[PDB]
Design a protein around this ligand. Structure first.
Ligand SMILES: O=P(O)(O)OC[C@H](O)CO
Ligand SMILES: O=P(O)(O)OC[C@H](O)CO
Ligand SMILES: O=P(O)(O)OC[C@H](O)CO
Ligand SMILES: O=P(O)(O)OC[C@H](O)CO
Ligand code: NA
Ligand code: NA
Ligand code: NA
Ligand code: NA
Ligand code: NA
Ligand code: NA
Lengths: 330, 330, 330, 330
C-alpha cells in the first residue's frame, strides 16, 4: 500500500481524499493544513457539489478517524517540519498551491517523504505528467506535477487527434465552472480584474493553465495550440471546445471512430466517448479526464473541425493525481 | 413617424416596445397577444433583466396608455383578423415565433399592414437582413426577417475580417445566455433533449444555424463558416468566439485596427470596440449588436486567430429590428 | 410485492420511480405519459439534480427494460384507457397533476387498478395523508392523496411541538427551491404573475396552502397555522421556518429533546434531527420529510420560538408516496 | 456643500459614491483604499449589479477625474495619516469594516475630518441612527453609525407597527442576497462554518446584524424582537419576513392603511408601500430602505401577523448613509 500525506485540504485535497477511499493500493495517513481537526471533519463530511462523505468521520484527540482509521492532523506552515517519516508517508499530495517549485516542494523530502506530486502546474521545470499523454515518459523523478484539470482534458484528446490525423494548428476554449479564486460579488482581484467580477452574474473571459502546457507534455505539439477560458456560473464540470486544422483529411465519422477506439482501448479510463444528449451535470463525479461528446462537435470540412470534450475539473483531476502517485511508485 | 404593431409580447416584443419609446421615428400603436391588458402592463412595467419601465403605464378599458399614448390591445390568434388598418399600422413586428413563412406572415398584410418584419430567421425563402452586413441589398420586399441575435453578432464581425484579410474558413461557438425556451428543472423538450435540462444547473450544448445563416446575408462566406452554442446560467448577454483562418497575414494589432476603424466609421452603432476588462453584465442593455473584445482574443500566428465579440441578445437584436423597420420604410 | 403504475413522468414520477428501485415491497410495472420510451429512458438515465440512474436502462420495441425488468410504456391521455389490469397494477401513483378529484382519479380504477395515490393535494374532499401525522387514520379508502412536500415537512414537526407544548398559533415561511412550474426568464404565468418572473434572478413570494392543509391532517391544529413561501434560485431542497407561540413554557433545550426523542422513536425515518452546521445541499437526496436544524432555530423566550426544518422536496415526498402506497395495501 | 471622504472602496463605498453623484448637498472629494487609481476607476465604471457608471471616469496623475471633478486617491493603511484637512473633508464615510469603534474611527478626526459615519454597526457604544427610527435623537455626536442594511429595513417597519398596534413580541427572518463575505465554492470560513459553503448552490442559515440592534435604535422594543437570516443565490436585494404578536387588534386592511399612511407621509422616502406583484429584482436600485409588500403578507388573526418588506441591501443603505451625513451636518 502506498502511504500518502496530503498538504492542503482545499477542494483538490478533499476530493483526492475521497477518491483514495475507493482505492486499495493507496491509503491516506495524514493531512496537513491550517484548520482544526473538527473543521476538517466537517469539510470532509459535507460537500455542496459531491454530497455526503461515504463513510464515518470522527475526531479523537485532535486527529481524524475516517472509517475507523486514524489520520494524523497537523497545521505546519513550513513543510520542512512535517515529520512525514513518523507516519510512514511514501508520497505527498502537494495541494496548497504554495509549493510549485523543486526548491519549495523538496522540503517534503527533507521532512521524510520519498516523493511529491504537485496538484497543479509547476512554476519551474518540475516535469509534468498527464495520463494518456506522457505517463510513459516518467523516468524515476522524485518530484512531479500532474499539470492542471484543463490540461488533463485537452492533452489526451489532442494526442489521439494528432497521432491519427496530424494537428497543423489548433485553438481551444474551455467553458469553465466557477472556482474558489473567483468572487461572489464584484470585489478586489488586482492582478486579474475580470476575475474579481461577481461569478454567479457573469460570463468571465480568463486565461488558461492549459495554453502553456500541452506543449510541455506533448512536445510534438509545442507552438501548435493555444487558447483561453470563459468562466460561467456553474459550480463544477467544464468543457473543452477544440478547433483544429488537420493534416490528413478525416470525415467526422472517421474522427469519431478513432476517438472511440482510444477510449475503448489504450486510453480506457482516461478518455471517454459518448453519443448521448449529455449536459454538464451528467459528468459531476466523472473519473475520466476527457469525455468526447460526439454529437456536440461539428466539422466544417475534412480538414477543419471543432471537437468537444467534458471534464469534472475536481473529480477527474483528483483521480489522476492518485494515478500519478501509483505510477511513480511502481 | 412609422406606426408599428407588435404581434407577440414575449421577451423580444417587450424589449422592442421599450426600445421604440426612445426613438422618434417609430411609434408603437397596437399590441396583439393572448394576454389581458393588465397583465401586459405588468410585464412591461417590471423586468427582471432590464429593470422598471422608464415611464408611465396605465390600463384603461382593456387597452394600454403608455406615456400618455393609447395602445390598442387585441387577442387574435389568427393574424388575418387583426384589423391593422384601423390603427394605421405601417409595419408589423412579427414576434410570436409562429409566422415565419411568407404564407403565414402575409396574413398581417391581408389585415391591412403594409410590411412585416419577422423577429427571427424565416423558415422559407423570405429574405433575411442584418445591419452592417446586407441592409443595402434590401429591394422593397414587403415581408422580411431580421435573422437572429447570434447572426447579428457574427455577420458584422465576419464581414470586417473577410473584407480586410479574407476568411479561408471559420468555426464559431456562442456562449449563450439562458432563454425562454429552456426549463427551470429537468423537463420535457422532445425535439431538443439537452435543451430540456435544468438551465441554471448546466452548461448545455446546442445547435445554432446562425453561422451558416451568415452565408445567406454574406454570400461570399457561404459554406465557409459554421458553429454551435453552449447555453449557460446567465439571464442575458452572450458572446461569440470566432476561430478563423485568414488569407492575408495580419498581426493581432492589425486586426484590432481594422475592427476599430469599422466601429468608428462604416459600422458605427452596429460594431463596437473595447479594450477594457469587460464581463458579460457590462453589456446588459447594449445597443451595438457586436462588441469586439480586443483583450480577450488570441492569435496563434498571423493566419489563425480567435476573436471574441459580445452581444446583448435581447437589446441589440430588438434595436436592429427597429432599424430594419425604418430601413424598409425609406 | 405491490405492483405500481405511474401516471406522469415529471419530477415526482421519475423520483418515485428511482426510489421504488431501492424497495423490495414495491415494483413499478408500467409508466404512462405523452413521451416516447426512448425519451423516457433518457430522462430516467440522466438527472441534473440526483445524478445518473443507478442501474441499466434499455429501450426495446417501444417499452422500457430497467435493471432487466420490463416496464410497459403507454401514452394515453384518458386514464380510463390505461388497461392497468393487463399488467396487474395494484396501485396507481397519479403524478400528472391533472386528476386531483375523485371523479378524474377514479378512471384508473375503471381501468383496472385497485387504488390511487395522488402525488399532490386533492382538489375535492379526497382524504390526504402525511406520514407521521395521520397515516393511522387511513380507513380503506380506494383513492387518497399524499398532500404536498411542504405539508410533509410541517405536519410532523407541528405534531411533535403541539403534542409536547401546545401550539397556540403559528405562522410559517418556506424558503423553497425552484420548481418546474417556474420560468427561466420573465414569461407568461397568467394565474400567478410573480411565478412567471425569471426563477434564477429572483426571490419570489408565493402562496402556500400547506400550512392550512396541516389542519386537514392534524385537525387539532385547524385554524391555528398558516403561512407563505419564497421561491429562490436553487434547484432542489427547501426549508420550513416555523414561528409558534406555545402554551407550556419550554426552553430551547427542551424543544430539542422532544424533537430528538420523536426522531429516534415514533417518527423515525420521517422526522430527523441534526446539530451540525448544515446547508441545503446537505439534504439533496434526503429521505426524511422533515429534518430539524437545532442550531438554526431561535427562541425569543420560553413561549415564542422560531423552528427550522429541512426537506428535499423531491426525494422525501417521493419516498413517502411509496410509504402511502404500502400503507394502504396492508 | 458637504465635502466627504470615503475610506474603503468596497461595495458600500462604491454605491455611496454613485448615490452622492445625484445629490447637490454632498460632494465626494477623496477616496482612500489599497487600490491603484486606475483599478478604482475600473470598479466605479463597471458594476455587475447596477450597470455602467452614469458619467465619465478618467485617471490623471494618480487621481480620479469623475465628471470633470478631481478626486484625491490615497492608499493609507492608518487613518491617522489621511490628511483629510488638505482636501477640506467635512465628513468621512468609514466603509472599510475595520474601524467600528470610537478609538479607531476617531483617528479620522485627528487626521482633520470633523465627523465620521460608520457604514456598519458599531462594535462599541458609538450611537447608531436609522432614518425613520431615531434620526431625531441625534444630538451633535461627531462619530455615529448607520447600523446595517437589515436594521434599516426592519426598524422603520417595526416602529410604525409598534406605534400603532403595540408589538408584544416578534421574530424575524431576512431572506438575504449573497454578499462579499461568502465563498463561490465550499471553502474556509473557520468562524462561521455554514458561511463557507458555496453561495450559489445553497440556502445558508446565518445570524443577523439586525437582531442585536433594532433594540438599540428603538429602545422601547429592546428584548422584544430577534431573528436570523437565510443567505440565498441572488446577487442583491433582500426581504424581511416579520412575524409579530400585537397588543391592539388590527385587521390586515388596517395594518395596510397604517403602513401606507406612514409611507405617504412622515416616512416618505424611507418606508415604501406597494400592492403590485413584485419580486426581488423590482427593487434593484431602490432607494427606500423598507418597501412593504401588502400582497405578500398574511394574517392568521387580528393579533398575529406576518409582514413582508423589501430592501436593496446596497442602494437603500448607501443612500441613507448620505442622509445621515446630511443630518449630522445640519
Ligand atoms: O499516454 P501515456 O504515456 O500516459 O500512457 C498511459 C496509458 O494508460 C497506457 O496504457
Ligand atoms: O447593412 P449594410 O452593411 O449593407 O449597411 C448598412 C448601412 O450603412 C446603413 O443602413
Ligand atoms: O402517520 P402517523 O403519525 O399516524 O403514524 C405512522 C405510523 O407510525 C407508521 O405508519
Ligand atoms: O424616525 P426618525 O427620528 O428618523 O425621523 C425622521 C423622519 O424623516 C422625520 O421626517
Ligand atoms: Na484507500
Ligand atoms: Na511549521
Ligand atoms: Na417612439
Ligand atoms: Na422495487
Ligand atoms: Na454630489
Ligand atoms: Na498609513
Amino acid at each position: 500500500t502506498i502511504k500518502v500525506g496530503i498538504n492542503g485540504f482545499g477542494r483538490i485535497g478533499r476530493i483526492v481524499f475521497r477518491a483514495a477511499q475507493k482505492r486499495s493500493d493507496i491509503e491516506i495517513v495524514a493531512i496537513n493544513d491550517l484548520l482544526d481537526a473538527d473543521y476538517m471533519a466537517y469539510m470532509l463530511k459535507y460537500d455542496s457539489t459531491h454530497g455526503r462523505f461515504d463513510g464515518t468521520v470522527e475526531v479523537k484527540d485532535g486527529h481524524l478517524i475516517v472509517n475507523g482509521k486514524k489520520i494524523r492532523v497537523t497545521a505546519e506552515r513550513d513543510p520542512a517540519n512535517l515529520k512525514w517519516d513518523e507516519v510512514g508517508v511514501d508520497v505527498v499530495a502537494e495541494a496548497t498551491g504554495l509549493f510549485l517549485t523543486d526548491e519549495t516542494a523538496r522540503k517534503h523530502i527533507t521532512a521524510g517523504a520519498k516523493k511529491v506530486v504537485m496538484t497543479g502546474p509547476s512554476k519551474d521545470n518540475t516535469p509534468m505528467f498527464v495520463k494518456g499523454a506522457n505517463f510513459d515518459k516518467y523516468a524515476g523523478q522524485d518530484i512531479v506535477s500532474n499539470a492542471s484539470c484543463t490540461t488533463n482534458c485537452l492533452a489526451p484528446l489532442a494526442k489521439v487527434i494528432n497521432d491519427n490525423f496530424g494537428i497543423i494548428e489548433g485553438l481551444m476554449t474551455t467553458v469553465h465552472a466557477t472556482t474558489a479564486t473567483q468572487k461572489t460579488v464584484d470585489g478586489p482581484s488586482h492582478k486579474d480584474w475580470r476575475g474579481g467580477r461577481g461569478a454567479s452574474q457573469n460570463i468571465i473571459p480568463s486565461s488558461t493553465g492549459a495554453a502553456k502546457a500541452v506543449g510541455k507534455v506533448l512536445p510534438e505539439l509545442n507552438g501548435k495550440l493555444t487558447g483561453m477560458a470563459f468562466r460561467v456560473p456553474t459550480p463544477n464540470v467544464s468543457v473543452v471546445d477544440l478547433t483544429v486544422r488537420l493534416e490528413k483529411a478525416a470525415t467526422y465519422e472517421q474522427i469519431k471512430a478513432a476517438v472511440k477506439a482510444a477510449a475503448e482501448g489504450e486510453m480506457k479510463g482516461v478518455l471517454g466517448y459518448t453519443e448521448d444528449d449529455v449536459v454538464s451535470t451528467d459528468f459531476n463525479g466523472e473519473v475520466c479526464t476527457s469525455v468526447f461528446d460526439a454529437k456536440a462537435g461539428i466539422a466544417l470540412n475534412d480538414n477543419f473541425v471543432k471537437l468537444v470534450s467534458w471534464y469534472d475539473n475536481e473529480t477527474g483531476y483528483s483521480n489522476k493525481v492518485l494515478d500519478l502517485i501509483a505510477h511513480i511508485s511502481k
